[PDB]
Ligand binder design. Structure first.
Ligand SMILES: CCCCCCCCCCCCCCCCCC(=O)OC[C@H](CO[C@@H]1O[C@H](CO[C@H]2O[C@H](CO)[C@H](O)[C@H](O)[C@H]2O)[C@H](O)[C@H](O)[C@H]1O)OC(=O)CCCCCCCCCCCCCCCCC
Ligand SMILES: CCCCCCCCCCCCCCCCCC(=O)OC[C@H](CO[C@@H]1O[C@H](CO[C@H]2O[C@H](CO)[C@H](O)[C@H](O)[C@H]2O)[C@H](O)[C@H](O)[C@H]1O)OC(=O)CCCCCCCCCCCCCCCCC
Ligand code: CLA
Ligand code: CLA
Ligand code: CLA
Ligand code: CLA
Ligand code: CLA
Ligand SMILES: CCCCCCCCCCCCCCCC(=O)OC[C@H](COP(=O)(O)OC[C@@H](O)CO)OC(=O)CCCCCCCCCCCCCCC
Ligand code: HEC
Ligand SMILES: CC1=C(/C=C/C(C)=C/C=C/C(C)=C/C=C/C=C(C)/C=C/C=C(C)/C=C/C2=C(C)CCCC2(C)C)C(C)(C)CCC1
Ligand SMILES: CC1=C(/C=C/C(C)=C/C=C/C(C)=C/C=C/C=C(C)/C=C/C=C(C)/C=C/C2=C(C)CCCC2(C)C)C(C)(C)CCC1
Ligand SMILES: [Cl-]
Ligand SMILES: [Cl-]
Ligand SMILES: [Fe+2]
Lengths: 451, 82, 137, 334, 34, 341
């Protein structure tokens, strides 16, 4: 048997894909066919969502995570996030799903029918894991494809309809970006921001200009690096530093994807710019701030002076200062004062919330949004009962920010475990004790006693 | 080793097995289905049907409050549903 | 106990006339109540203003009276404050503000009546629980 | 050999009584800072306004605590997720009032414990061992990350991180049940199976190997003297142990491969603790346990309580009393 | 030369035949409307 | 060769499922405990004893079904089918909670039978009975929790009910009423259970990662022969690793495996003792010095005082529904509550 059994390949069935490590043709088929399943899911799930979609309910009351990604890109939506035309969602769905069939055709062909290994069919597509030059060149190719991809997002924003801008004046609208940010002081200042509260590292990006700009930088950086790695081979210090094997390379990618999954988790939980609350529901901080606003408005309508109302602890019942003096909402939501959102910023002055604006300039749409966001806070049960844990059945709701953050923390953590597993194993295999200690030269036995 | 019984792989793959169990398994299932569908499970165990938890205008539960008059209490509760 | 036409008979107007609902309408009104109202009115309280609940005793003391189908249907078209003095379609969903509350667009007169019937039938079933809040969970 | 190479050989030396290693270079200063700050604060730190409401909680021994009630109190809710190093405070007195030691301790600790994990991989590479011990440690480390870091991140405040104290831990657990129904979450139920089963199988394996010790000693001396450190042969009879245990249940529910047996011992509690850590980490984003409150109703519509509704009444008691001065508005949204 | 009826036979059937009977009862319960 | 000796040979016959003398106690009792739980979670209510639904028949799922304890008014009655409470009536027996005593009592004697089964098999194979000895801890837990605890209380009503969320209720009751987290006997129980899981995980992983190479495959499992005389992993390398990582290590294989018996076994025994104390309400609920200070000094607050306020909320908010035979009527205005919530 061409591997395909434990005797000849040295791997059991439960580690059977390890048999493909040195069969480049059969390995190609697995990768392409699996890529087919990814494109398939993106396809079928969009159609599923569209089939279940009711345009009169908010997207986030309907369990949708893919249609919000298409709407953010400016397709299918008008002012306020309102769905104008669902046809683009159908196109996105059908086109991915059809593509998965040519991917699936190619993967099943390469895995079953085609050559087991590629190295005798063409020195271009074949490779040895240990070939440092060939390995960096494939890396270089894929770097170039990634940077092109980043530039496609730019072309949509600047030349092909714009992006949905939750900050656009008048309640949000699709909008063409004509002045991307290119100042590297801003683009890279994000990378040097602290990840802690009030700074938020790159999760704090709050305007589409910076977003489009950053993707011009990344797209050109990837294209440069792709070329760099196609024309270069690794330097001495890099060769002594890494393990050069199929398994080590996998373990470096597992590390990378873990880090990225943690960042994604925090992006969807905190960022309301590239995850517009119009589509994903309010953020945790946002909902909690919206509750303080709601009851500020109600009590003020009754004749309360919200600025001078002393709460039970002595802090203001409605308004207090943050630790650096800014006027902020009171109560437990004091933890969330870093929140920024289109519905709240018009009440903000140089020293924080402005009592004059609070007393006079609160519009009904702000009261509407605050009530809506407060009653769509991202709390709810695994069986999709909305609210705190003590609420009764009635509301069938779990925020998509909850679904997206929890699922990706779980994915990010298991890939960190995978990184440790395959990184440790690649080190041991390359030194030659991954199968156990050699009885005839147990290293400990040649070392002095500790005591 | 072997304690002398017929191996399990041998039986579930044999034809005589599934000939006998193509009937017994679904028959037991259907028998179980009929135990509930006929309403017989309610009367064996004394479990309320969805209409016999409360009387029409009572919000108190028929809690048994006496050790030796207990079976007599439940009978009194059961006749105030009618 | 069970769902009887006696339980399902609620005031139609303020003039003591009544109307009897079916099972289908009651479950329809509950389905539609969850769809459009429960985010704020779960169990008969009001999350964004707990001072006002959906108890029949409360609806009776609203101006105009709201403890009958017609008064409840009218509130869902042109809602007012509790004393009747201000209209609040700008901040409370209604047919009059179906533009800014899009969930109200696909509601027909038949639907609003089913919703009101639910609101009026439910406290006869749950008693204190309806509009009582967590004390009675 | 130059100085740098000499230094590298000492750092990675396998002859040090305690292995240092490159992970050890980070681990040693960070664990020492955390340990020394924790000891001093547990004995001496003044009261801390954990909930940001000017209502300080006394945690230290000198301020009227004992071992069971003492804690290093989490930092003020007014701070939220902001970074609060000593140099950001106007004075040590302000840093203490607002809960500064808690941030100092947990950041150094999580860093050191991550390097502890790394240090376990490192020494195993220098000794020629297989590398996956550090993977098993990832389960307790992941759990520590969940209570001190991830759960504060989801909720927006290190003031809802787990206190560094015995009673402070129970407070965390109760408040958590009210707000997430963690008992009704299958990932916690999986953690319970993880540690119950872990303890079960720990006792099983201990009792079965001990049941089959080969007679090597008289009745006066300890049986432990039948094993000599590093002896080549085994000291128990796995065939006899299999023979007992195969008959106790049935023959195939029992292991006869030592390797398969020991991998089962590692895999069971580690996987379960992975899940319970993943449960704290996903409830950090308020995906809570099953809500069956009022899930059964009768033909009229009356609520027929189940045991789930009884759990909810207890949850409601924790909810309404916890942090009894910290809420101005009716929903406790984080 | 295997028997068909053994103590083993009795053991597996004491469990299995009520199990399937109970599964059919529970399946039927899914269709009870209040 | 009497008839006794002939019966002995058939019981101790080597078959797929060993029977033995102990089986006569074990198999009937375990099967009826098991069967009684399955019967009661599937078909039987708790409406008349508790005011609760508890079966799939009523609409409960796997997490909310239970065989619930009998009503408080039954006291500690054995609740025999032929007893004076049910008087032969099977349907009434089910409604009055007889399945709880049925399951509790048959399960008690099934546990006895299982331990004798360990002694019986141990003697016939010729190994020492340390596995029987370890099983004493589960027995101690079962007896203290299901039998001794309610016997010290007013009735079987307050023992655990057999169900997933019924046990969760028991947990929270023990927090709110007994302050059981503060009890050092439970703390020792926690340390033994968490420590047993630790020892299980660390021993398994140490063996798996100090194996000798005894085959050429990447699956190391096939390189173990149960008749081989040699250790399958290196104790000397395991020892050095832990010595340099953690400071100390095991050096004795027998002590290592005795320690793994000892730790969880002693933990469960210690927690059993505290429950016996709770049978009498002999709690470690308070620290008196803290209450004296707190009562006099309204600025003194610790995590201990904070937890008692939580306990007080549990008691008042759950008692009316949890003990319905008490007819607790707590008006809103007396329910303890913080601000706003
Ligand atoms: C090799 C690695 C070496 C690493 C060594 C150095 C690592 C230090 C990094 C610290 C990570 C912990 C701090 C993160 C805490 C936090 O506030 O992180 C969250 C921040 C986001 O910060 C928030 O960002 C927000 C941005 O929103 C703002 O801007 C938005 C714009 O739309 C909105 O307007 C919003 O309202 C407005 O407030 C605000 O600034 C908040 O105040 C601020 O808290 O995310 C982040 O920066 C993204 C990164 C999250 C960290 C990933 C977690 C990793 C945990 C490991 C998992 C355990 C491992 C398993 C153990 C085995
Ligand atoms: C360990 C190894 C493992 C072995 C496991 C084997 C499992 C065997 C299973 C056996 C279970 C025994 C059930 C005993 C029932 C019981 O006790 O039932 C209780 C009855 C006493 O009845 C109770 O008596 C109470 C007191 O009443 C008295 O008080 C009233 C006013 O005070 C009235 O005057 C009343 O008439 C008067 O009788 C109340 O009436 C209760 O409702 C009523 O149930 O005693 C009796 O049956 C017998 C009383 C003698 C005690 C027998 C010892 C067994 C119990 C030891 C537990 C001690 C634990 C104490 C807490 C620690
Ligand atoms: C998928 C992306 C990817 C990957 C996997 C690689 C992988 C590799 N690159 Mg390449 N590279 C890329 C994209 C990528 N590159 C792009 C887009 C560019 C263009 C900017 C380059 C430019 C580049 C150069 C110029 C060189 C490499 C080299 C290397 C090799 C050494 C790796 C190394 O030391 O890591 C990094 C590990 C280290 C220990 C180095 C220190 C890194 C510190 C600790 C991290 C912090 C600094 C960080 C780079 C920037 C700060 C980020 C902060 C603001 C958050 C390795 C094969 C080297 C090589 O061998 O060339 C042939 C080399 O000299 N790469
Ligand atoms: C999506 C995940 C995935 C993918 C892409 C692969 C891919 C592959 N596996 Mg792995 N594997 C996986 C999951 C996966 N596996 C899992 C989960 C397990 C554990 C159970 C294994 C266990 C395993 C073992 C033990 C072995 C492989 C082997 C192989 C390779 C040859 C398979 C072979 O001989 O097929 C032969 C099978 C058939 C001819 C039956 C039909 C197969 C086709 C593909 C059915 C597809 C139908 C589908 C509907 C497509 C039709 C649509 C059309 C338009 C194309 C191949 C590259 C083998 C290998 O390495 O060989 C060197 C091998 O020995 N795998
Ligand atoms: C990143 C992945 C991701 C995320 C965040 C979601 C999120 C969501 N999906 Mg989706 N889905 C996914 C992947 C994902 N899905 C995949 C791969 C499939 C194919 C099977 C589907 C198929 C699908 C359907 C068919 C439906 C959803 C629906 C939903 C919503 C409710 C889900 C629910 O009740 O969970 C239920 C919770 C569970 C089943 C628990 C799963 C826990 C796993 C088993 C443990 C993890 C194990 C592993 C080791 C990790 C929610 C918005 C529903 C919806 O509302 O549609 C609009 C719906 O009907 N999804
Ligand atoms: C990354 C994926 C990948 C890779 C590296 C390969 C590589 C290879 N395949 Mg495979 N194949 C793939 C995908 C892939 N294929 C897919 C998807 C299909 C189904 C359509 C096939 C079907 C297939 C068959 C049936 C055969 C091969 C053969 C070959 C070999 C020669 C191909 C050649 O000369 O083309 C040279 C290149 C061209 C002719 C240019 C066309 C490539 C497209 C049109 C460029 C478009 C790129 C696109 C813009 C990028 C975006 C796509 C997506 C991300 C949206 C080589 C080993 C042959 C072989 O091994 O002989 C026995 C063979 O007979 N392949
Ligand atoms: C190992 C077998 C076993 C054991 C230990 C038990 C034990 C028990 N059962 Mg269970 N039971 C069993 C099998 C068993 N059962 C079987 C197989 C069934 C199916 C029919 C049942 C069905 C069942 C029901 C339906 C009920 C019980 C109940 C009980 C309890 C009361 C028992 C009682 O008072 O007996 C009294 C009888 C004896 C003590 C037997 C006396 C022995 C003889 C007569 C003594 C005289 C000997 C003589 C003087 C000298 C002989 C010497 C020799 C040389 C001849 C107890 C927990 C009750 C219960 O759980 O209540 C809640 C109950 O209602 N059982
Ligand atoms: C590790 C986890 C192992 C769990 C078992 C998986 C075994 C799987 C295994 O290793 O091999 C499978 C084993 C061997 O089967 P055979 O040898 O008959 O199969 C021939 C095979 O060689 C072909 O695959 O089959 C079983 O024993 C089936 C188990 C059902 C047993 C039914 C017995 C019911 C007894 C009553 C309940 C017990 C009471 C106990 C005392 C109270
Ligand atoms: C949050 C945006 C709400 C939604 C969704 C619904 N209601 Fe509402 N309701 C809400 C508030 C804040 C108030 C108080 C208004 C005021 O200032 O007076 C109300 C009030 C009512 C009433 C009056 C009850 C009374 O005691 O007089 C009724 C009858 C009512 N609301 C009905 C209702 C219906 C039928 C809804 C679904 C279509 C609905 N509400 C949704 C807040 C919110
Ligand atoms: C190798 C292998 C494997 C794997 C495989 C794979 C992974 C595959 C894939 C494959 C694929 C990936 C496939 C795909 C396909 C696709 C399709 C077939 C599609 C179709 C489509 C259509 C037909 C559509 C239609 C439509 C339209 C157009 C419109 C709307 C409606 C509808 C939707 C109907 C396994 C593991 C099994 C085993 C071993 C071996
Ligand atoms: C798009 C966008 C943007 C931008 C971005 C950017 C511009 C980025 C960058 C990025 C970057 C720039 C990154 C970097 C990274 C790095 C890393 C990740 C590193 C790593 C390292 C490592 C891994 C190493 C390791 C080691 C050591 C340390 C020693 C020796 C050994 C080894 C080598 C292993 C923004 C935000 C503005 C906005 C939004 C959008
Ligand atoms: Cl608290
Ligand atoms: Cl608040
Ligand atoms: Fe062992």
């Amino acid at each position: 048997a061409t591997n395909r059994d434990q005797e000849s390949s040295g791997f059991a069935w439960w580690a059977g894909n390890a048999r493909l490590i040195n069969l480049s043709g059969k390995l190609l088929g697995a990768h392409v066919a699996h890529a087919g399943l990814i494109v398939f899911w993106a396809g079928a799930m969009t159609l599923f969502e569209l089939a279940h979609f009711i345009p009169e309910k908010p997207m986030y009351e309907q369990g949708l995570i893919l249609i919000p990604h298409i709407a953010t890109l400016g397709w299918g939506v008008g002012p306020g996030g309102e769905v104008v035309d669902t046809f683009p969602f159908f196109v996105v769905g059908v086109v991915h799903l059809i593509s998965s069939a040519v991917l699936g055709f190619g993967g099943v062909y390469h895995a079953i029918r085609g050559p087991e290994t590629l190295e005798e069919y063409s020195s271009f597509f074949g490779y040895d894991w240990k070939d440092k030059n060939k390995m960096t060149t494939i890396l270089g190719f894929h770097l170039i494809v990634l940077g092109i991809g980043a530039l496609l997002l730019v072309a949509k924003a600047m030349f092909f309809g714009g992006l949905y801008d939750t900050w656009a004046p008048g309640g949000g609208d699709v909008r063409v970006i004509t002045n991307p940010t290119l100042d590297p002081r801003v683009i890279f200042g994000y990378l040097l921001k602290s990840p802690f509260g009030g700074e938020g590292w790159i999760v704090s990006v709050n305007n589409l200009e910076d977003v489009v700009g950053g993707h011009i930088w990344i797209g050109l950086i990837c294209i440069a690096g792709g070329i760099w790695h196609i024309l270069t081979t690794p330097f001495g210090w890099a060769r002594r530093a890494f393990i050069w094997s199929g398994e080590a390379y996998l373990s470096y990618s597992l590390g990378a994807l873990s880090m990225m999954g943690f960042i994604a988790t925090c992006f969807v939980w905190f960022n309301n710019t590239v995850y517009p609350s119009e589509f994903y529901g309010p953020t945790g901080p946002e909902a909690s701030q919206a509750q303080a606003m709601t009851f500020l408005i109600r009590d003020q309508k009754l004749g309360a002076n919200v600025g001078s109302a002393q709460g039970p602890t002595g802090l203001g019942k409605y308004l207090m200062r943050s630790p650096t003096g800014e006027i902020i909402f009171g109560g437990e939501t004091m933890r969330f004062w870093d929140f920024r959102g289109p519905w709240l910023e018009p009440l903000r002055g140089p020293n924080g919330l402005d009592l004059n604006k609070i007393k006079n300039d609160i519009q009904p749409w702000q009261e509407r949004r605050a009530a809506e966001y407060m009653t769509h806070a991202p709390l709810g049960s695994l069986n999709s009962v909305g609210g705190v844990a003590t609420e009764i059945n009635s509301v069938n709701f779990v925020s998509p920010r909850s679904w997206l953050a929890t699922s990706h923390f779980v994915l990010a953590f298991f890939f960190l475990v995978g990184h440790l597993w395959h990184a440790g194993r690649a080190r041991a295999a390359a030194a030659g004790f991954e199968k156990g200690i050699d009885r005839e030269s147990e290293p400990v036995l040649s070392m002095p006693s500790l005591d | 080793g072997t304690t002398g019984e017929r191996p399990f792989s041998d039986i579930i793959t044999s034809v005589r097995y599934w000939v006998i169990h193509s009937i017994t398994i679904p028959a037991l299932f259907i028998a179980g289905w009929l135990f509930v569908s006929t309403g017989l499970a309610y009367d064996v165990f004394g479990t309320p049907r969805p209409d016999s938890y409360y009387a029409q205008e009572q919000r108190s539960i028929p809690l048994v409050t006496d050790r030796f008059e207990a079976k007599q209490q439940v009978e009194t509760f059961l006749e105030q549903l009618k | 106990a069970e769902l009887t036409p006696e339980v399902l008979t609620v005031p139609l107007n303020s003039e003591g006339k009544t109307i009897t609902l079916t099972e289908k309408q009651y479950l329809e009104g509950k389905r539609l109540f969850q769809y459009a109202c429960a985010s704020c009115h779960v169990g008969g309280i009001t999350k964004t203003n707990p001072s006002l609940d959906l108890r029949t005793e409360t609806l009776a003391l609203a101006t105009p009276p709201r403890d009958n189908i017609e008064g409840l249907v009218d509130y869902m078209k042109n809602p007012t404050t509790y004393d009747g003095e201000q209209e609040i379609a700008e901040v409370h969903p209604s047919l009059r503000s179906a533009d800014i509350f899009p969930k109200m667009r696909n509601l027909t007169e038949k639907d609003l009546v089913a919703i009101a019937g639910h609101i009026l039938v439910e406290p006869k079933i749950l008693g204190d629980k309806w509009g009582g809040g967590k004390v009675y969970y | 050999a130059n100085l740098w190479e000499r230094f590298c050989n000492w750092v990675t030396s396998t002859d040090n009584r305690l292995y240092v290693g490159w992970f050890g270079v980070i681990m040693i200063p960070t664990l020492l800072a955390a340990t020394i700050c924790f000891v001093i604060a547990f004995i001496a730190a003044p009261p801390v306004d954990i909930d940001g409401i000017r209502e300080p909680v006394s945690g230290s021994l000198l301020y009227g605590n004992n071992i069971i009630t003492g804690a290093v109190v989490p930092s003020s809710n007014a701070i939220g997720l902001h970074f609060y190093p000593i140099w950001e405070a106007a004075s040590l007195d302000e840093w203490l009032y607002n809960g500064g030691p808690y941030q100092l301790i947990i950041f150094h600790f999580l860093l050191g414990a991550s390097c502890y994990m790394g240090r376990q991989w490192e020494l195993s590479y220098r000794l020629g061992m297989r590398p996956w011990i550090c993977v098993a440690y990832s389960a307790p480390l992941a759990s520590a990350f969940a209570v001190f870091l991830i759960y504060p991140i989801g909720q927006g405040s290190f003031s809802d991180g787990m206190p560094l104290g015995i009673s402070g831990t129970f407070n965390f657990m109760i408040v958590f049940q009210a707000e997430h129904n963690i008992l009704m979450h299958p990932f916690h139920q999986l953690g319970v199976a993880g540690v119950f089963g872990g303890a079960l199988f720990c006792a099983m394996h201990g009792s079965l190997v001990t049941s089959s010790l080969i007679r090597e000693t008289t009745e006066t001396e300890s049986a432990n003297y039948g094993y000599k450190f590093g002896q080549e042969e085994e000291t128990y009879n796995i065939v006899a142990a299999h023979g007992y245990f195969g008959r106790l249940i049935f023959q195939y529910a029992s292991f006869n491969n030592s390797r398969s047996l020991h991998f089962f011992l590692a895999a069971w509690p580690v996987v379960g603790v992975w899940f319970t850590a993943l449960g704290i980490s996903t409830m950090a984003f308020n995906l809570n346990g099953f809500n069956f409150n009022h899930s059964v109703i009768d033909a009229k519509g009356n609520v027929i309580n189940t045991w789930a509704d009884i759990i909810n009444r207890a949850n409601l008691g924790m909810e309404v009393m916890h942090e009894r001065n910290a809420h101005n508005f009716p929903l406790d949204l984080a | 030369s295997y028997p068909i009826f053994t103590v083993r036979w009795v053991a597996v059937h004491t469990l299995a035949v009520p199990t399937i009977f109970f599964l059919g009862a529970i399946a039927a319960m899914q269709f009870i409307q209040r | 060769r009497g008839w006794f000796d002939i019966l002995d040979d058939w019981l101790k016959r080597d078959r797929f499922v060993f029977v033995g003398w102990s089986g006569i106690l074990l198999f009937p009792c375990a099967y009826l405990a098991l069967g009684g739980w399955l019967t009661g979670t599937t078909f039987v209510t708790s409406w008349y004893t508790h005011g609760l639904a508890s079966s799939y028949l009523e609409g409960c799922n796997f997490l909310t079904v239970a065989v619930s304890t009998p009503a408080n008014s039954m006291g500690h009655s054995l609740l025999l089918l032929w007893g004076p409470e049910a008087q032969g009536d099977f349907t009434r027996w089910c409604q009055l909670g007889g399945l709880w005593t049925f399951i509790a009592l048959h399960g008690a004697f099934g546990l006895i039978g299982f331990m004798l089964r360990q002694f019986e098999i141990a003697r016939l194979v010729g190994v020492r009975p340390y596995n029987a000895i370890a099983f004493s801890a589960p027995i101690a837990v079962f007896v203290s929790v299901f039998l001794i605890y309610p016997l010290g209380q007013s009735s079987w009503f307050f023992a655990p009910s057999f169900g997933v969320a019924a046990i969760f209720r028991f947990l929270l009751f023990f927090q709110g009423f007994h302050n059981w987290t503060l009890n050092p006997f439970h703390m020792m129980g926690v340390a033994g259970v968490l420590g047993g899981a630790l020892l299980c995980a660390i021993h398994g992983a140490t063996v798996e990662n100090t194996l000798f190479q005894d085959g050429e495959g990447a699956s190391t499992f096939r390189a173990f022969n149960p008749t081989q005389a040699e250790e399958t992993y290196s104790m000397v390398t395991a020892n050095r690793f832990w010595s340099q990582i953690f400071g100390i290590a095991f050096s004795n294989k027998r002590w290592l495996h005795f320690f793994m018996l000892f730790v969880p076994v002693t933990g469960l025994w210690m927690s059993a003792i505290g429950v016996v104390g709770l049978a009498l309400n002999l709690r470690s609920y308070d620290f008196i010095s803290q209450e004296i200070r707190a009562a006099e000094d309204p600025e003194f607050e610790t995590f201990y005082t904070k937890n008692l306020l939580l306990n007080e909320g549990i008691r008042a908010w759950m008692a009316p529904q949890d003990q319905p035979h008490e007819n607790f009527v707590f008006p809103e205005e007396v329910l303890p509550r913080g601000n706003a919530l």
